[PDB]
Design a protein around this nucleic acid. Sequence first.
RNA 1: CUCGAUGUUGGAUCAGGACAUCCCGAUGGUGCAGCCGCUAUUAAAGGUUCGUUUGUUCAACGAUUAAAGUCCUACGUGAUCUGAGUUCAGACCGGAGUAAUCCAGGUCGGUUUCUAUCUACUUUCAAAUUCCUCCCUGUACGAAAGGACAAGAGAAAUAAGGCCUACUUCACAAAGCGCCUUCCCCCGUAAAUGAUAUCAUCUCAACUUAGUAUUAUACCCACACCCACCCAAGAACAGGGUUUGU
RNA 2: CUCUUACUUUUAACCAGUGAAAUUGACCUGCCCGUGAAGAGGCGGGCAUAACACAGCAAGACGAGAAGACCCUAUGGAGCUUU
RNA 3: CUGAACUCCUCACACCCAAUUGGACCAAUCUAUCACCCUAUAGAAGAACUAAUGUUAGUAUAAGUAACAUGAAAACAUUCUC
RNA 4: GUAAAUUUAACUGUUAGUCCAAAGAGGAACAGCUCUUUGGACACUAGGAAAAAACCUUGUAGAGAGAGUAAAAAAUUUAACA
Lengths: 43, 305, 110, 99, 118, 150, 154
Amino acid sequence: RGRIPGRQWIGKHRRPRFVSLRAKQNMIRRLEIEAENHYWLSM
Amino acid sequence: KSGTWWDEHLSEENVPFIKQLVSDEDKAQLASKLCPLKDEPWPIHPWEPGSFRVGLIALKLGMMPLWTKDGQKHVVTLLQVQDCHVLKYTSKENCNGKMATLSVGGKTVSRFRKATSILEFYRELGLPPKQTVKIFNITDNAAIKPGTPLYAAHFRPGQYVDVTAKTIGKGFQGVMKRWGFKGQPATHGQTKTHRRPGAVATGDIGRVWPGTKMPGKMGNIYRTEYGLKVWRINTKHNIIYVNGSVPGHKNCLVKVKDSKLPAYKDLGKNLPFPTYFPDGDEEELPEDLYDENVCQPGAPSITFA
Amino acid sequence: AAPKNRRTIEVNRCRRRNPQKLIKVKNNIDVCPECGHLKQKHVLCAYCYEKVCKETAEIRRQIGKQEGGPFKAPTIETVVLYTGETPSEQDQGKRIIERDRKRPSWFTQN
Amino acid sequence: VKCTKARYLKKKNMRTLWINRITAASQEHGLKYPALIGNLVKCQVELNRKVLADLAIYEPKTFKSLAALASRRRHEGFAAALGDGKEPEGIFSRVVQYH
Amino acid sequence: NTRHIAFSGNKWEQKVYSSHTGYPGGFRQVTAAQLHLRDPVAIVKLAIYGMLPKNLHRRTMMERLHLFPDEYIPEDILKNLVEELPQPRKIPKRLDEYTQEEIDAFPRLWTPPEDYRL
Amino acid sequence: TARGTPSRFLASVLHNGLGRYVQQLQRLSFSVSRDGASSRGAREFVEREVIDFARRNPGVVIYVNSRPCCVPRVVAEYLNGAVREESIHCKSVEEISTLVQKLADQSGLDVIRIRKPFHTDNPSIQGQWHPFTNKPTTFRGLRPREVQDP
Amino acid sequence: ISHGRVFRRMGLGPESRIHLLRNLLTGLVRHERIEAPWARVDEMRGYAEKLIDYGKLGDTNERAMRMADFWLTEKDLIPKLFQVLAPRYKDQTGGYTRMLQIPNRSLDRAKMAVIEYKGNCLPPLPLPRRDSHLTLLNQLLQGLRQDLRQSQEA
RNA sequence: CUCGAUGUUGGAUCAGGACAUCCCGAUGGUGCAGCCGCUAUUAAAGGUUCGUUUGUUCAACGAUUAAAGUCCUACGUGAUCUGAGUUCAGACCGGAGUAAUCCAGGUCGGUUUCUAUCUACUUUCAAAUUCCUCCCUGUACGAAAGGACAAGAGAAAUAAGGCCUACUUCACAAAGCGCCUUCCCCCGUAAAUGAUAUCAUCUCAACUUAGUAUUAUACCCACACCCACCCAAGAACAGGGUUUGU
RNA sequence: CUCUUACUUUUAACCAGUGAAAUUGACCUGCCCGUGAAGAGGCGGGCAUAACACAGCAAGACGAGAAGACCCUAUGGAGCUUU
RNA sequence: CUGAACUCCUCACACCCAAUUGGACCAAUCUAUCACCCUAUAGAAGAACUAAUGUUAGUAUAAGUAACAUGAAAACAUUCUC
RNA sequence: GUAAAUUUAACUGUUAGUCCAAAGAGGAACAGCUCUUUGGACACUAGGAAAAAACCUUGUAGAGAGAGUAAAAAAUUUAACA
Ligand SMILES: [K+]
Ligand SMILES: [K+]
Ligand SMILES: [K+]
Ligand SMILES: [K+]
Ligand SMILES: [K+]
Ligand SMILES: [K+]
Ligand SMILES: [K+]
Ligand SMILES: [Mg+2]
Ligand SMILES: [Mg+2]
Ligand SMILES: [Mg+2]
Ligand SMILES: [Mg+2]
Ligand SMILES: [Mg+2]
Ligand SMILES: [Mg+2]
Ligand SMILES: [Mg+2]
Ligand SMILES: [Mg+2]
Ligand SMILES: [Mg+2]
Ligand SMILES: [Mg+2]
Ligand SMILES: [Mg+2]
Ligand SMILES: [Mg+2]
Ligand SMILES: [Mg+2]
Ligand SMILES: [Mg+2]
Ligand SMILES: [Mg+2]
Ligand SMILES: [Mg+2]
Ligand SMILES: [Mg+2]
Ligand SMILES: [Mg+2]
Ligand SMILES: [Mg+2]
Ligand SMILES: [Mg+2]
Ligand SMILES: [Mg+2]
Ligand SMILES: [Mg+2]
Ligand SMILES: [Mg+2]
Ligand SMILES: [Mg+2]
Ligand SMILES: [Mg+2]
Ligand SMILES: [Mg+2]
Ligand SMILES: [Mg+2]
Ligand SMILES: [Mg+2]
Ligand SMILES: [Mg+2]
Ligand SMILES: [Mg+2]
Ligand SMILES: [Mg+2]
Ligand SMILES: [Mg+2]
Ligand SMILES: [Mg+2]
Ligand SMILES: [Mg+2]
Ligand SMILES: [Mg+2]
Ligand SMILES: [Mg+2]
Ligand SMILES: [Mg+2]
Ligand SMILES: [Mg+2]
Ligand SMILES: [Zn+2]
């Protein structure tokens, strides 16, 4: 049981990928850097 | 470093003497156990619900017809008890099981063809070796002292029993005789395929399931026939007339005991318990013990009146 | 059906040198008390059985010189005599086969 | 090729082994691996996994001193998290500066 | 005391242990309760066997594991003990195990009406 | 490979360097050719370098056998008995001057895989760890659930 | 499955089997000793025993003469059965022949056997002999016997 | 993906599995009186016929059955079979084409190899399913016609496993056409007590009952006399007997 | 055929003698689910697992055998017919 | 906190793309001249094989497998069976 | 801010494309389908997403029994009513 039709991560019916908690934090950490980059590029 | 047998170095004069010598000892050993109630027997408890007594080990003589008082014909199997004794007893605790085991042997065999460890067990028991030794699960209130002889009157007419024995050996056989496969037709183009199994499995699995019916050795295994009643008991020769057929060939040793079928549960209330002791019997039994619905040979002809 | 792969010498030594393949030692061998040669406990001595056949053949060659043809067997008993022997009391009216040789020691006159 | 690629696994499996041995020696003193490594760095003690695991086997009395130090610095961090800055820093929380 | 383990949630009913005899139709599925009544040491034994590394050494580690349903232990195994590990879970107390001090120490929170039948 | 080769533990010869350092290189045997282009670099090493190299290493006995040969070799013998044979075939003086000095610096122990980059005969000073090291003792040395004074 | 089958399957069929056994029996009556494969002799030994029983019935019994006429291909041997062999075993009721195993023959390493008629005029075969009564073991038993006999008489 | 080859119809043989259940089992609803039915919930242990025409799968038809289930497994299975059909080389009819030749066409005929190296398997040991008959009973039900369930008894079939007294094929024995034996359950719901919600309420409230088996028990359980012989044991090996080793 | 059975012979298997062939990348050559050049003994997660011969079976090794004869391609051939 | 061949640290540095392209070295053989336990500088060339259902030869696997053979006794004279 | 670019001379090979995101066409707002455009990756290494050509992290090459990091783990539990 549990076949993903075809190849997993391509096509119409794909294997679902879920966002972990550290994946969120990793993205937020990147945003805080680039948000501070906008401040130093403004003067 | 060469093996030897019992009469390899004996002369022409000692072979007859040794044969008769050991033969007379067996007679004396067997004729010394006929009084078990005088030789410090163990306590004799009465029969209680849920009790299980010992069985016997008989020899299959043959088959005989039998007619009832209604006219119907029944075929029975003759089971002779010969040299049956209790070898040892193991308690429930030491048994590592719910019940307690009682060991029983049958059919005295030669001492020259047995293992040393087996010969010494019988030496202290005061009995000749036995061919077959079977284990019976009993209750604490049915233990019998080892060396006690066992007879055919241990069972009674109207009682159902379970006979176990090895089946006739037929060697390596195909699927047609071993499993009842139909095979293939004789004509209409068939090419060297008349008694073959055909397909053994599907293609997907890529293998053969365990337990798949294939050619192999058939027979020569233990099988039990449940629900066989005792029609007649002969006390002179210690013979049991069992209904129908039983597994095994003629002159084979079979295991007999009360039937486990629920329908015949708690029917040993009127039976001997633990076993029948002729030595202490207040009155000897008749020659033969018949059932109510059995018409004896001496009886007159049947008449539906 | 053909082999899919080649079997290795390691696989084949385990099949060829399996104890079942090996020859089993025999323990039924002993010496003949007469000649001292070897023999099996259940088989006759090849040496002592051979000397009976050499003499038995010579006796059968003498029988032919008396019969002098086929389908000429007698209706009486037969006796073998050697140099230095005469018909016994019980060997009367029999077919004596004269042998130009000393009687074998193992051959006991009956 | 296996021997040439195995030089990356050897270094990885060593550090995996050291950590497993440090984790075991820290539980003997009621500590976890993250609380020992993280709080020894806070005390300016720069000892690597290789040395620490060697100390746990051959210098057990020195490894308990390092675990007691980490537990002391860990408790000072909690105490500072309960205050609002008024209370001064702990004795083992001070940092030596290099100019 | 492997017979007195406690599962959280409804795992006695939901959790299933599945096996196969190898024969057609030999796939069996029993609940943890059914297995526990049949073998009071199988649940703890199967959890440990699944946590050990998937290698040849695992069957050697399981010979050094001794499980007993009740608190009885053989003398031999009881003469070579060294240390007793603390229980991970703290067994909570029933309302009949509290002393009269703790019951009176905990304050009452509401004032029931006097005309309530209860 | 390591599995296709042998190995040894890091070691020294007679605990060298502990009380004093003793040079393990004991003998050097050169085989140069009077004629031959292969030995050109070896001939120039014997004219200016070998004499100055012996002044610095007085404990090494150097033998220069000039004979016909197509491949010149230098044989180094060490105190421990090891013998390493090397070829200076078509090598410049600078290459032979760094080679001979390498031989003088080595100990003679087989140049094979060394298991550990460290060696100590006294690894512990507080006691090698054992199961009971960090365990507390109980009153009367009792065991778990052991009835005392029964 | 062969349970109870007492006769073997040799030759090219049931009839050929009887013809093979007949050629061995005929040679056994002419020479009184032959060597042949062990299985073929053990199968013929039974017929050699029952042939003497027909020779004791006499040459006047037609049934007995029809057996010898069939089982003896050479007709000069029929009088030898009724006039030489049967009289010899007149006192005996059985055990007219002895069969002994001999070394396997070289050509095919087949199991061999020698069979003869007891009382023949040929050099005695090297029969196997039992250990003497004067041996250590038999003397220890002979002494045991005497006591058991002596005690019984007492 | 495979054309330095994955042999393709149906059938025979052996069947593994799913449940979306044709029959048997347990339940709710009914425009369910009863006997028959419709519908839904649960259940995959067990079972699911013989024949005429057709190459057929299907389909029609005849006679039955408690029922003659739907599907997947390389449209399961040709190193097991079959070759009627399709699908070469021959030929005929009709049609197309100047002809050679061709057609979704129809028709007669037409070579089906392989000594098994590896994997897997070769006694899942032993609780059985159903119909009919009698009886209940011409009872409940019902205007009438009509016609039950449960309990109980008996007699068969099939299946599984065994046996040879007789019968039959046979004859120191092997067989069936013959005889003997065959033991547990399954959960959908229906009901009480009683809170959240002071009634009531079968309760993913605590609880009670119909309502549950550690599936029961049975079988098996000793071991260098063993060269040789014998056997109801067997390919070999092994096994049983020799107190019948001239 | 319902519905098979018994016996003989050959074959067979064991002993002795003689002694081929196709085939073979290497092999220390298990099962379930999943994955994937889309159908796994070799990958992932699990289960199983001292070594070894002989006799059987034909589900798999997309088993062996013949560089597919069906189909398509080649400015590759050939036979036949023809306004 | 764990976590790369990313980055830092000690030392070193030309030393991880198919087709294609550029460049630096080189085995053995012959020749010239050297050399003289096997080399040097150059000049030449039938100048380097884990693979073409490759060619020849040898030996394995399958495999001690498939398959093959002699009518019987005896005096080797002869007879008997078919 | 960076160090490439054009031209001149002399050549070979590639010209049978795959998935992902985005804008679109065809198909059925099916296809691991087909056809263009923009860009990325693969056809080169390593780590991660379970196994993994195309998603994410990451590139310039050696040794080391040192260190700091990158991407990187799935969450949810339901219907009373005057
Ligand atoms: K997909
Ligand atoms: K499979
Ligand atoms: K193809
Ligand atoms: K409610
Ligand atoms: K028959
Ligand atoms: K196969
Ligand atoms: K093929
Ligand atoms: Mg897929
Ligand atoms: Mg048999
Ligand atoms: Mg048939
Ligand atoms: Mg054929
Ligand atoms: Mg046929
Ligand atoms: Mg191929
Ligand atoms: Mg359903
Ligand atoms: Mg079914
Ligand atoms: Mg198919
Ligand atoms: Mg075929
Ligand atoms: Mg097939
Ligand atoms: Mg046809
Ligand atoms: Mg026409
Ligand atoms: Mg046709
Ligand atoms: Mg024809
Ligand atoms: Mg085959
Ligand atoms: Mg009824
Ligand atoms: Mg109520
Ligand atoms: Mg209420
Ligand atoms: Mg052979
Ligand atoms: Mg090939
Ligand atoms: Mg798969
Ligand atoms: Mg095999
Ligand atoms: Mg493969
Ligand atoms: Mg081709
Ligand atoms: Mg042309
Ligand atoms: Mg790291
Ligand atoms: Mg880098
Ligand atoms: Mg670099
Ligand atoms: Mg060179
Ligand atoms: Mg060349
Ligand atoms: Mg080569
Ligand atoms: Mg080649
Ligand atoms: Mg083979
Ligand atoms: Mg053969
Ligand atoms: Mg282009
Ligand atoms: Mg183009
Ligand atoms: Mg595409
Ligand atoms: Zn002799």
